[PDB]
From Swiss-Prot, chain A:
Subcellular location field: Mitochondrion inner membrane
Oligomer and partners: Complex I is composed of 45 different subunits.
Keyword Nucleus assigned: no
Major place of residence: mitochondrion
GO CC entries: mitochondrial inner membrane; mitochondrion; nucleoplasm; respiratory chain complex I
Protein name in UniProt: NADH dehydrogenase [ubiquinone] 1 beta subcomplex subunit 5, mitochondrial
Organism: Bos taurus (Bovine)
Taxonomic lineage of the native organism: Eukaryota, Metazoa, Chordata, Craniata, Vertebrata
Gene that encodes the chain: NDUFB5
Family to which the UniProt record says this protein belongs: Belongs to the complex I NDUFB5 subunit family.
Keywords associated with the record: Electron transport, Membrane, Mitochondrion, Mitochondrion inner membrane, Respiratory chain, Transit peptide, Transmembrane, Transmembrane helix, Transport
Swiss-Prot record, chain B:
Compositionally biased region (Basic and acidic residues): 31-44
Subcellular location: Mitochondrion inner membrane; Mitochondrion intermembrane space; Mitochondrion
Notes on the domains: Contains four C-X9-C motifs that are predicted to form a helix-coil-helix structure, permitting the formation of intramolecular disulfide bonds.
Species: Bos taurus (Bovine)
Family as reported in the entry's similarity comment: Belongs to the complex I NDUFA8 subunit family.
Designated gene of the protein: NDUFA8
Function: Accessory subunit of the mitochondrial membrane respiratory chain NADH dehydrogenase (Complex I), that is believed not to be involved in catalysis. Complex I functions in the transfer of electrons from NADH to the respiratory chain. The immediate electron acceptor for the enzyme is believed to be ubiquinone.
Oligomer and partners: Complex I is composed of 45 different subunits.
Protein name: NADH dehydrogenase [ubiquinone] 1 alpha subcomplex subunit 8
Highest taxon listed in the record's lineage: Eukaryota
Residues of the full protein shown: 116 to 172 of 172
Length: 63, 57
């Protein structure tokens, strides 16, 4: 292979690896915020579903 | 002139005309927490695959 092919093939390799490296750093930062704040799709732990509640009038009024 | 109600009558659900306003927050509920921001968009393939260590897919 001529030097130009190897040289520009290297640049293509470096671009992919640097792009992956940035995403690996971003993912660790996003995970840290999501776990600490609970405001994202991840670390979303269940709470009781509110559709289970019965809202019809009850045998007694104070409820 | 009192006529005894028939079997079944007093267990009917009836309607009442009331001047009283309808309560708005009878439970005294606080404002509910805002829901989590909603993820949306078009699902695209993961950039460069799993990105797990050395794997290229
Ligand atoms: C029918 C053929 C179908 C076809 O035409 O396409 C297949 C393919 C051509 O399709 P292609 O889409 O053009 O990709 C070709 C690119 O050059 C290659 O495409 P690529 O650039 O996407 O790279 C392949 C890619 C694809 O994703 C994969 O991970 C495929 C995994 C390949 C398994 C190889 C296992 C043997 C490892 C060496 C031993 O691999 C990776 O994602 C990361 C590298 C994985 C390396 C695996 C070694 C590390 C694993 C740790 C445990 C093993 C350590 C070594 C022991 O032809 C093949 O080379 C076969 C694929 C290899 C697996 C199937 C053959 C089994 C070989 C058994 C090895 C025996 C070991 C003896 C000891």
């Amino acid at each position: 292979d001529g030097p130009e092919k190897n040289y520009e093939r290297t640049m293509a390799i470096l671009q992919i690896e640097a792009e992956k490296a940035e995403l690996r750093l971003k993912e660790l930062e996003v995970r840290r915020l999501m776990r600490a704040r609970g405001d994202g799709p991840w670390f979303h732990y269940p709470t009781i579903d509110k559709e289970l509640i019965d809202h019809s009038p009850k045998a007694t009024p104070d409820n | 002139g009192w006529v005894r109600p028939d079997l079944g009558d007093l267990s009917k659900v009836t309607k009442v005309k009331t001047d009283r306003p309808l309560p708005e927050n009878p439970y005294h509920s606080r404002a509910r927490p805002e829901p989590n921001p909603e993820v949306e968009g078009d699902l695209k393939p993961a950039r460069h695959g799993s990105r797990l260590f050395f794997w290229t897919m």
